Amino acid sequence: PIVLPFVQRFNNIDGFMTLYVAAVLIHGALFAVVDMTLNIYQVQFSLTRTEWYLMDFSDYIASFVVAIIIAHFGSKGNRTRWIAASCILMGLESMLFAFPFFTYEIIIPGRQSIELCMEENEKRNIICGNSVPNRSKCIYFHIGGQCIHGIAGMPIYILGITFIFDHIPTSSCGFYLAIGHSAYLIGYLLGMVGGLQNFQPPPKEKTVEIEPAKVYQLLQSGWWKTFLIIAAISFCVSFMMVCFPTSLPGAHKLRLAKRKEQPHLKGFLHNIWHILKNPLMLTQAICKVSEYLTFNTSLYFLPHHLQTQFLITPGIASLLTGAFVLPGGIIGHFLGGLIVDRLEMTNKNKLKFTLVTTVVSVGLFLLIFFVECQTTTFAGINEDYDGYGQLGNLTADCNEYCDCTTSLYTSICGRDEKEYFSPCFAGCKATKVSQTEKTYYNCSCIKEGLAASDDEGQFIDAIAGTCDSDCLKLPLFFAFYFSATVFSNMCSIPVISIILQSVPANFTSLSLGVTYAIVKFVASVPAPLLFRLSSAIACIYWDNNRCGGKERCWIYNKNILVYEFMGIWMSSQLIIVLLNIYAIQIHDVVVHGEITE
Amino acid sequence: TIFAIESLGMIPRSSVYLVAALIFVLMLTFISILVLSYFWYLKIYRQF
Amino acid sequence: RYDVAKYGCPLTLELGQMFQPIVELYDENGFIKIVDANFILWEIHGRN
Amino acid sequence: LLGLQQMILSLTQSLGFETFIFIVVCLNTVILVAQTFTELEIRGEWYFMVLDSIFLSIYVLEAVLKLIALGLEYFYDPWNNLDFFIMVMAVLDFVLLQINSLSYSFYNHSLFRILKVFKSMRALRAIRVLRRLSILTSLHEVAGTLSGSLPSITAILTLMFTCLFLFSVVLRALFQDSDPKRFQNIFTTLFTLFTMLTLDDWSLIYIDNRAQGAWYIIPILMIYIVIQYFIFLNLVIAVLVDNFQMALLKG
Amino acid sequence: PLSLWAGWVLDSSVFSKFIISLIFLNTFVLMVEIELMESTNTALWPVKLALEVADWFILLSFIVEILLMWLASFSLFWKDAWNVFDFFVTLLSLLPELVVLLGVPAHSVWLQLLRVCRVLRSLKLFARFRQIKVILLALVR
């Protein structure tokens, strides 16, 4: 008996769009939290990188195997019911991911393993690996969570854009696509910010070795809070959207205005035949594949590039790459949508516009390479430690005294402008710590040094972290990355607008699924293998003494990595340019044939 | 007799590239605004 | 190489200030008187 | 009590504003000119500020009556806007003195200076409202013929402002590390350019700048002085002379 | 384009409002930077550098303004009315960038004369009123 004007306004198209923005925002937040949660889980819980790759590919293959089936299901049934079911499965997924971080928080603690480790011994706390037991259950939980996450998240990005395509005019389709992409982007930002504001240790960062144990407790506690909050929000959104009627009044009015003036396997095969016969769709699909490949490569590579070239600490480098890939991206998406919406862009003009954007992006990438051709301060790789020992003298008496592990070696900076790996191996057996800075005392394995330094209460103080004297190229590179992100995010909206034009209204549901299958299978499966091959080509000097099977390198060759990644990016962009220059002629031929003026 | 003086000066960081980043952000935004106005006038010159 | 056993504790002077090198005479038990003479200052190594 | 109250207020406002306001403002002016008067305040200082508070209470009663009066057209009068502003600062400083306690400096402070200059435009507004009668037609016509050419003199003062600001910028720029101690900041700069514009010891500026190592700054100051002097003074003199000259040509 | 573009950007009120806003913002900012160039406010030092570089951006806006002037009659504009004086003043205001990029201004820089030249050009290109114009015509005759 709800005949309220609140309902009569909530069934409007803007009412649907508000909850779609909220759902895309919470999906982006959950995905951004989940990715770095899996990364820190793999870093902390004593596993190998191949398993991280496996449970990262599990989400992608689940999305691939759910996309076509959910497009086929929504092509015949109500999209709202499937969206609500996906949101319900999403809310279940968030709690299923939260459960291991609260039930199984005693897998690998600092000292809480009282059965096989004792407090008075330091060596016995890092051996007798009972953490490997009760970890396979967590692996099963995480792989199931990734599977249900893909199965519950994909249909959304399919059916919401299907709703936009089938019940919004093209004058606002670009705006809705742009604000949906911006909602996903700001969800990524907000999720990473909430994750990194709690996973990072409190201002008591530099206390005694109960600090890793309390950080280990705190990060799982924070994930347990955040995932239940996300699950409650998703369940509330699902329940609110369930109350929405199937027959939308605004959609029915639009259909009545536009009326004037069985998905069978054979129909599926005919549709695939039409898709393969029209080469515009193939060109746009490969262009989207290359754009996604370039975006993912840049996102995965920029923090590592900052560590190896600008000496940017991992989390700070990832924070920089995140927090400065969004302001360009959201503005580019908004501009790309708004240009088409305000100016009523045509298909040939869209192709020319995308070609111009890709050309200027290629020029900007060339400028980025030219800037990277400049030199910078070099840390390490000084062709053996000044003649005292070889590459492999890191396991000295100074290393053996304080019991350092090679998997967490940081960079110290002496006062003679020489940077040394393993600050504890640098000879410093005393560590007195200030409130805002880490430093090392009484260093004996170090060189002469002691040039200037600075202290008040003592002396012989080696500061922690990587010292930098010429880091002014970073803001320039960040501005160039702003421009590159703008022109990369601004290319995608005209492609989707092109995709809308060539497909009739009744079949517009399956086009998004067809494109998204190539997005997640053809592009997303071999790209990490290619990235690992390039990374193995670059990181020749692996830690073969202890680390073994290529788990942690130390010498990341800046010139080789820059040259290879820029060659890959230039090849992808030139492939996009060639596809666009083919598609311009193809679309001109098709238009001339269909017009025959 | 001996004595050594260490007096602080005012040699700061140049920050020339740090502000050249702002220069590049600015004229890229100006070029984008000019391109938007360019496309708008390409839409609206056919009336005349 | 600077040190303290041969060069003494150095000054820690802040941004540009005014200093007069004023020296007094001392022997055996203690100081005798303030020194009024003609002075010359020279750096250890050489600057301009 | 709407329009009927407004018309009752109009009639009784005419009557009581002619009767009560004139005598109380005359007494306020008498006590204020006996107050300023820095020889009789020591023959006082206790019978003075009590009468100030009493007549400020009378003035805030005038403000209350004007607020309860017709409103918008009362606000439309610029003099009444000045009255409202003066009553705002009057209630502000009255409650500031009334609350006591506080945490800032006192005992004849800069805020107290601001307060007694506040009482100075209070006295000025009392003088302005006491001259409702017998303004004298000769000086009334003289003042009207003064105010006839407002746009010309405003344009000329805008020009002189732009020219002084340009001269201040160029002289502060050319005088860098040339003993700025007289004009180290913008205020003292523009004050030195005011002295240069008002013929005040710029010959002394020349003689104590010859003691410095800069000599070419003296011809620059020289030509700037003479051009701004002749141009501005001649423009204002000519404009006001002709403005009264059409009035002379008329009746 | 070209001359048509110059006419359109002169006719549009948004461009005129933007350029006059930049003009008076630059004139207001110009005297701020000369007041303090020390470590009195550490947090206000990078933003003051950014304000000086915003003035450099105003010089780049003058560069694109003379590009719009190149879009006009080009060689005919080399000998004209006070607009050619404005062009010369903008060139003299672009000159300090060159003399700090390659001149090493530890000498008689004379940057201040060009600065006051561009300041007076901004103070004259401020959409002067008709009351100013009539008295200026009286002064020139």
Swiss-Prot record, chain A:
It is a multi-pass membrane protein. GO terms for molecular function: organic anion transmembrane transporter activity. The record marks 406-407 as: Reactive bond. The keyword Disulfide bond applies. It holds the Pfam family OATP. Residues 39-50, 101-138, 198-221, 304-317, 374-472, 532-559 are extracellular. Belongs to the organo anion transporter (TC 2.A.60) family. PANTHER family: ORGANIC ANION TRANSPORTER (PTHR11388), SOLUTE CARRIER ORGANIC ANION TRANSPORTER FAMILY MEMBER 6C1 (PTHR11388:SF129). This is Solute carrier organic anion transporter family member 6C1.
Curated annotation (Swiss-Prot), chain C:
Component of the CatSper complex or CatSpermasome composed of the core pore-forming members CATSPER1, CATSPER2, CATSPER3 and CATSPER4 as well as auxiliary members CATSPERB, CATSPERG2, CATSPERD, CATSPERE, CATSPERZ, C2CD6/CATSPERT, SLCO6C1, TMEM249, TMEM262 and EFCAB9. HSPA1 may be an additional auxiliary complex member. The core complex members CATSPER1, CATSPER2, CATSPER3 and CATSPER4 form a heterotetrameric channel. The gene is Catspere. It comes from Mus musculus (Mouse). Auxiliary component of the CatSper complex, a complex involved in sperm cell hyperactivation. Sperm cell hyperactivation is needed for sperm motility which is essential late in the preparation of sperm for fertilization. This is Cation channel sperm-associated auxiliary subunit epsilon. Belongs to the CATSPERD family. It is found in: Cell projection, Cilium, Flagellum membrane. Testis-specific.
Swiss-Prot record, chain D:
It is found in: Cell projection, Cilium, Flagellum membrane. It comes from the Eukaryota. Disulfide bonds: none annotated. Disruption phenotype: Mice are normal but males are sterile. Male sterility is due to defects in sperm motility unability to fertilize intact eggs. Sperm of the CatSper1 null mutant lack CatSper2 protein, while sperm of the CatSper2 null mutant, lack CatSper1 protein, suggesting that stable expression of CatSper1 protein requires CatSper2 and vice versa. Residues 38-46, 100-110, 175-185, 199-215 are extracellular. Residues 69-76, 134-151 are cytoplasmic. Residues 186-198 dip into the membrane without crossing it. The chain crosses the membrane at residues 16-37, 47-68, 77-99, 111-133, 152-174, 216-241. Testis-specific. Belongs to the cation channel sperm-associated (TC 1.A.1.19) family. Pore-forming subunit of the CatSper complex, a sperm-specific voltage-gated calcium channel that plays a central role in sperm cell hyperactivation. Controls calcium entry to mediate the hyperactivated motility, a step needed for sperm motility which is essential late in the preparation of sperm for fertilization. This is Cation channel sperm-associated protein 1. It comes from Mus musculus (Mouse). The lineage of its organism: Eukaryota, Metazoa, Chordata, Craniata, Vertebrata.
UniProtKB/Swiss-Prot annotation, chain E:
Residues 37-45, 106-108 are extracellular. Residues 72-80, 128-141 are cytoplasmic. It is found in: Cell projection, Cilium, Flagellum membrane. Testis-specific. Disulfide bonds: none annotated. Pore-forming subunit of the CatSper complex, a sperm-specific voltage-gated calcium channel that plays a central role in sperm cell hyperactivation. Controls calcium entry to mediate the hyperactivated motility, a step needed for sperm motility which is essential late in the preparation of sperm for fertilization. Belongs to the cation channel sperm-associated (TC 1.A.1.19) family. This is Cation channel sperm-associated protein 2. The lineage of its organism: Eukaryota, Metazoa, Chordata, Craniata, Vertebrata.
